[PDB]
Amino acid sequence: EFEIPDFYVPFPLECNPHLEEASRAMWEWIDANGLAPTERARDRMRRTGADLSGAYVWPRADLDTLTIGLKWIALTFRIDDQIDEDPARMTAIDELRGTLHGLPVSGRSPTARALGALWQETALGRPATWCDAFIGHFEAFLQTYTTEAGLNLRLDDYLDRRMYSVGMPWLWDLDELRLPIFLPGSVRTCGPMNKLRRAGALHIALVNDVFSVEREQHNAVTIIREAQGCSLQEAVDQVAVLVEAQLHTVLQARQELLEELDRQALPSRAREAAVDYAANVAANLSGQLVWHSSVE
């Protein structure tokens, strides 16, 4: 038992108003692909708030963009779910990874073909530059499963991995689908955008570690606990400090991003798309708080 911090995040609260319509489409796609055959998984799907989660990740998205996003969340839930039924699972991750590079599947493999299909629908006809970013981030995410099972822990090294395991970088890549244009390469990977992406992802992950530690180990509060040996509250306290650091960096990066966008030679609509994307990343940090409060 500990006092969970009352995290302050300044950015306005935003939630996608297409939730109901998109969620029905998600479940329809889940059942048509048979991705939740067991009642335990079906119950846990709606209990964790997988659909609501999407409404807070992409609050500005049109109905069709939210819908594809919810499919990715739903599939990720299944990937995670059937991994939990298990060290021979390394082969399954490598198979999933292959589908992202057009490798046909040999076996029957229900989930691995579902990824192949969703990947095909998401990626084909999109700019290669975007696809490469999305696959790179989604692959990093999948790789954390083999890393985290091989390790079954250092703080600095955990944060490096956690930025990707939390899934935010590939989730934000998908936000580009609703913008009037894709981010130029020069913007997607500029210093301020990289700084924002890392700090944003880590802020959300570390807040997740604090909300999680009751259930529970790959977690910032547990790592700090069984190294120093001090209180659970004292560990949560130090993670709160870490969260605050990430928020300071988010704010700094966003200011630096506007200056960088003004420096770069960009058409106005590209500049405008970048400002919007950044504001959406920031919005996620307030959205998380209300999402957690809702699933309780």
Swiss-Prot record:
Stated EC number for the protein is 4.2.3.187
Q: Name the pathway it acts in.
A: Secondary metabolite biosynthesis; terpenoid biosynthesis
One GO MF term: terpene synthase activity
Report motif location: DDXXXE motif.
Answer: 80-85
Q: Kindly list the residues the record flags as site (Important for the cation stabilization at C-11).
A: 141
Q: Which residues bind Mg(2+) 2?
A: 85
Top-tier EC class: lyase
What keywords sit in the KW lines?
A: Lyase, Magnesium, Metal-binding
- UniProt motif NXXXSXXXE motif: location: 208-216
Listed under catalytic activity are:
(2E,6E)-farnesyl diphosphate + H2O = (2Z,6E)-hedycaryol + diphosphate
Query: Mutating residue 141 to W has which effect?
Result: No effect on synthase activity at pH 7 and 8.5
Paste the cofactor note. Answer: Binds 3 Mg(2+) ions per subunit.
Q: Which co-factors does it depend on? A: Mg(2+)
Query: Quick one: which residues bind Mg(2+) 3?
Result: 208, 212, 216
The family database entries (Pfam families) matched by this protein are listed as: Terpene_syn_C_2
**Its GO biological process terms?**
terpenoid biosynthetic process
Q: Which residues bind Mg(2+) 1?
A: 80, 85
Q: Where does substrate bind?
A: 162, 215
Q: Kindly give the InterPro entries that the UniProt entry links to this protein.
A: Isoprenoid_synthase_dom_sf, Terpene_cyclase-like_2
The entry describes its oligomerization and partners as: Homodimer.
Note from the entry: The 1,11-cyclization requires isomerization of (2E,6E)-farnesyl diphosphate (FPP) to nerolidyl diphosphate (NPP), the abstraction of the pyrophosphate from intermediate NPP leading to a (Z,E)-hedycaryl cation and finally an nucleophilic attack of a water molecule.
Query: Domain annotation text?
Result: The Asp-Asp-Xaa-Xaa-Xaa-Glu (DDXXXE) and Asn-Xaa-Xaa-Xaa-Ser-Xaa-Xaa-Xaa-Glu (NSE) motifs are important for the catalytic activity, presumably through binding to Mg(2+).
Protein family per UniProt: Belongs to the terpene synthase family.
Q: What does this protein do?
A: Catalyzes the conversion of (2E,6E)-farnesyl diphosphate (FPP) into (2Z,6E)-hedycaryol via a 1,11-cyclization.
What's this protein's name? (2Z,6E)-hedycaryol synthase
